Design a protein around this ligand. Structure first.
Ligand SMILES: *C(=O)[C@@H](NC(=O)[C@H](N)c1ccccc1)[C@@H]1N[C@@H](C(=O)O)C(C)(C)S1
Lengths: 336, 577
């Protein structure tokens, strides 16, 4: 129907354009550039196929996808592959899939279809989303995956922050939970774990945080014009070579990206479209402010990549498929 | 239903603004911190070693420190200007070895400038620098102690292997205060491969300097006075037929009774703290750890049998409970029958009528037999009440690791089953009344001050903060009686021949402890002694000397205190010149 928002598509295209340009120096392995190019082809073809669907059919599979995502998060801990101390991938040769992507895209639909009704703001307002969130995070902390769990909790927080808004009861609840849980984990934490957590806060410990400290010095190399990994540190490679007048260009595109995602979230009159696009833009923007915060030496290391800018076998496809659902509910914001 | 989304849009907008402001900080405000000299030079990051704190006593004499260790290493075997090096080094030849080898370890401050001019910055000749803990005025190990590198279990606690962990009695207590922050730096490396500019990213804290209450003057005399006791220990054991047992098992403590500061503490057989420190793997230190004796343990804080030193507290518990007035009448007979067996006296003839002052003087044992025989079952519990009140059961507050002093009560014997004949042996100190020389020195300091029960602390000040001494008072209605009996021991009792003609009027009490092993004539040598009982312009001082199985406290421990007391008040010997 050609009734999309081409401004959002141009912002995504401009970011993934600089991503392929930046991967020219960051890991210049031609074998890696092949698997990244064929990932963009499938990531764009899948979004083109998701446009052959209606919004009613999308939210019709909210509970099916949520129930199926819980089956994979419980199966990944059995027949999964351990890449970095955690099993969270399904690789059967030429296949590459992560169940955490289906959990996010499944929980946003399920929590939107569910919270379209009345939330009892008295006590049981948080009861329904917590009953749907803990089974997801619970099967993620048993991988373990702390970074992916924070994206889930932040997205669920965004969904509740749009419908619920228990501002007086939510902040006091967080301040209490943020003081009772550390008061219980710190005494039961081992010295191997206590120092590990303290190193996460203050990163000045070389045998583990040398590269993460080198990132702070690597970014400040060029102005006005060996790192650990390319995936978890695309920004440091890109910020080092392009100076500061460039960094504002990447921060600008991501700033304009989260703006149109929230702007298109407002154009939708339905509440479930308000919740779905808010949680998606919340989860997407949460990784960015966390990933770029790790590189700049502000946010603690969580092990997350830059969406639409990093090297991802499926993370690019899943991020594009998520944007396809964004463009889906926007052209269907009026019709029922 | 829309305003909350405007807030999230504003949130991530200000979030990316803070990141942009954070980048601008590193990019613009810190570009002078990461300059690369307009060349393809890489950047290497290295951590800065932490200067451990300096341990020094009062008056400023350094006792522990750490400086550079300059060594000469060379590989290849090129002569260079060796016609000058051979006489300077005194080797007369260059031993050609394949692996890198060290020549002249510990280059002095005079040879290093002469070597530096001859180093010429060549690839073969260089001067490696190292960090090692240096003790300019070594003090007895069991008190001072040693230093080792980070253990494998300690590495997981955030310790670098180059860091130095102190198992010492004194350096473990100060370890949280001596350790400095291991900083991190980064240096621009040229394409050739040299240092260009250093960049301090984490400033290394140089640790904190601890000021001790020990006096290096009294400390030398304390360790010295332990050795002449061996000549007295071997002399005493010679009359019994036992071997010379030349080992010097014992310790000594000298402290200020007023301010609670400890001035001299030494144990034997001590070791040299410089052994474990500077040497990578000293083979002599490995034998010290596997020693059949206890060369590392501080016998000043370990529990032993106090003997006649505990009877000073028995008299305190006897006067405060109201058992005996300060002018009671008891004849120091040679023998006393408790009811089952005969309690033996240290002597063999009748001494005469005595008081509490006279009983402490001549150290009569038959006094504490008749007096306790009145109420032997209830006094034992009240005895430990006053005993723990004087500082014999609880800790002394020392920074060094201290052992538990056991005081016997009726409740303790039930959990260990009590017999009435045990009280008399407990009254003198036989019934497992385990005490430590540190706790023993505190008990005398309480009676010397007449009520004040100060806390023993080696540290006078950490960094620059003067540590205030904590006091505590005990309810004592008759203090002078004990103080008079203590000097009556020096004036007329056991210490008559050593300290009778002594210039400073001293008081104290001798002590021997029938060892539980065989009771064959080699008791534990004990003697306590506090400072000027009279208003004589001499600073107060308490000294307590102990020797394992040394025997004859009047012959071994008593002269050991005379030596330390003479060193404190500056008592001249045969110096007619
Ligand atoms: C303690 O109050 C007295 N007796 C003992 O220490 C021992 N029970 C003892 C050892 C050897 C012979 C007889 C008794 C005094 N402690 C000694 C001392 O003051 O040095 C004493 C033997 C002279 S008497």
């Amino acid at each position: 129907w050609l009734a999309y928002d081409w401004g959002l598509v141009f912002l995504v295209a401009a970011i993934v354009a600089l991503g392929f340009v930046n991967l020219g120096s960051a890991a210049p392995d031609p074998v890696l550039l092949y698997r990244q190019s064929v990932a963009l082809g499938l990531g764009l073809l899948l979004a083109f196929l998701l446009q052959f669907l209606s919004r009613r059919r999308l939210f019709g599979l909210a509970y099916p996808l949520y129930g199926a995502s819980l089956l994979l998060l419980a199966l990944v801990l059995v027949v999964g592959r351990e890449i970095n101390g955690a099993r969270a991938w399904f690789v059967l040769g030429p296949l590459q899939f992560q169940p955490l992507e289906l959990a996010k895209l499944g929980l946003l639909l399920a929590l939107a279809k569910a919270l379209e009704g009345r939330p009892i703001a008295r006590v049981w307002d948080y009861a329904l989303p917590a009953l749907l969130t803990l089974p997801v995070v619970g099967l993620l902390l048993l991988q373990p995956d702390l970074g992916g769990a924070l994206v889930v909790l932040f997205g669920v927080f965004v969904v509740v922050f749009v419908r619920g808004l228990p501002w007086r009861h939510l902040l006091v609840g967080l301040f209490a939970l943020a003081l009772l849980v550390p008061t219980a984990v710190w005494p039961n934490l081992k010295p191997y774990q206590r120092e590990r957590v303290l190193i996460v806060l203050d990163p000045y410990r070389d045998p583990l945080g040398q590269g993460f400290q080198v990132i702070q010095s690597t970014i400040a190399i060029g102005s006005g014009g060996i790192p650990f990994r390319h995936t978890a540190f695309v920004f440091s490679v890109w910020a080092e070579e392009w100076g500061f007048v460039g960094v504002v260009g990447l921060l600008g595109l991501y700033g304009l990206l989260l703006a149109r995602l929230f702007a298109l979230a407002l154009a939708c009159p339905r509440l479930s479209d308000r919740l779905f696009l808010s949680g998606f833009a919340g989860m997407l923007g949460f990784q960015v402010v966390v990933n770029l915060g790790v590189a700049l030496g502000v946010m603690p290391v969580t092990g997350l990549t830059l969406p639409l800018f990093s090297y991802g076998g499926s993370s690019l496809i899943a991020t594009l498929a998520g944007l396809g659902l964004v463009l889906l509910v926007h052209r269907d914001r009026y019709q029922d | 239903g829309t305003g909350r989304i405007h807030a999230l849009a504003l949130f991530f907008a200000l979030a990316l603004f803070l990141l942009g402001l954070r980048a601008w900080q590193l990019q613009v405000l810190e570009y002078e911190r990461y300059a690369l000299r307009s060349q393809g030079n890489y950047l290497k990051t290295e951590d800065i070693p932490a200067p451990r704190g300096k341990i020094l006593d009062r008056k400023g004499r350094v006792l522990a420190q750490d400086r550079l260790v300059v060594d000469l290493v060379y590989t290849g075997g090129e002569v260079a200007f060796k016609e000058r090096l051979l006489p300077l080094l005194g080797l007369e030849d260059l031993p050609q070895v394949t692996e890198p080898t060290v020549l002249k370890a510990g280059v002095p401050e005079a040879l290093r400038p002469t070597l530096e001019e001859l180093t010429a910055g060549q690839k073969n000749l260089y001067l490696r620098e190292r960090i090692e803990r240096y003790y300019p005025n070594p003090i007895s190990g069991p008190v001072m102690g040693y230093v080792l590198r980070a253990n494998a279990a300690q590495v997981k606690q955030g310790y670098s292997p180059e860091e130095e962990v102190g198992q010492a009695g004194l350096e473990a207590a100060l370890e949280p205060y001596l350790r400095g922050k291991r900083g991190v730096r980064a240096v621009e490396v040229n394409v050739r491969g040299e240092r260009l500019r250093e960049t301090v990213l984490e400033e290394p804290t140089p640790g904190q300097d601890v000021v001790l209450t020990l006096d290096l003057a009294l400390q030398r005399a304390a360790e010295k006075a332990l050795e002449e006791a061996l000549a007295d220990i071997n002399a005493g054991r010679r009359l019994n037929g036992l071997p010379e047992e030349k080992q010097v098992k014992g310790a000594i403590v000298a402290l200020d009774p007023t301010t609670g500061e400890v001035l001299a503490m030494a144990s034997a057989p001590s070791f040299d703290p410089n052994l474990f420190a500077k040497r990578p793997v000293p083979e002599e230190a490995k034998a010290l750890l596997e020693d059949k004796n206890l060369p590392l343990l501080n016998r000043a804080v370990q529990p032993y049998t106090p003997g006649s030193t505990f009877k000073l507290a028995t008299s305190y518990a006897l006067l405060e409970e109201g058992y005996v007035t300060p002018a009671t009448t008891y004849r120091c007979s040679p023998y006393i029958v408790f009811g089952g067996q005969v309690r033996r006296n240290w002597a063999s003839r009748d001494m005469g009528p005595m008081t509490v002052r006279e009983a402490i003087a001549w150290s009569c044992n038959t006094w504490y037999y008749q007096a306790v025989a009145q109420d032997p079952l209830g006094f034992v519990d009240r005895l430990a009440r006053r005993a723990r009140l004087l500082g014999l059961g609880e800790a002394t507050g020392l920074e060094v690791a201290e052992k538990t002093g056991l005081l016997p009560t009726r409740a303790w014997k039930r959990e260990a089953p009590w017999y009435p004949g045990e009280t008399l042996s407990v009254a003198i100190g036989q019934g497992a009344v385990l005490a430590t020389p540190a706790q023993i020195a505190r008990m005398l300091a309480t009676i010397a001050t007449g009520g004040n029960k100060p806390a023993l602390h080696l540290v006078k000040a950490i960094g620059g903060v003067p540590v205030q001494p904590r006091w505590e008072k005990v309810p004592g209605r008759y203090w002078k009686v004990l103080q008079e009996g203590l000097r009556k021991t020096v004036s007329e009792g056991t210490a008559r021949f050593v300290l009778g003609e002594f210039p400073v009027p001293t008081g104290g009490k001798t002590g021997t402890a029938e060892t539980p092993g065989k009771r064959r004539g080699l008791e534990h040598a004990w003697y306590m002694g506090y400072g000027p009982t009279d208003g004589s312009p001499y600073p107060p001082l308490v000294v307590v000397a102990f020797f394992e199985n040394g025997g004859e406290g009047s012959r071994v421990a008593l002269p050991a205190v005379r030596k330390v007391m003479a060193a404190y008040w500056g008592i001249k010997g045969s110096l007619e010149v």
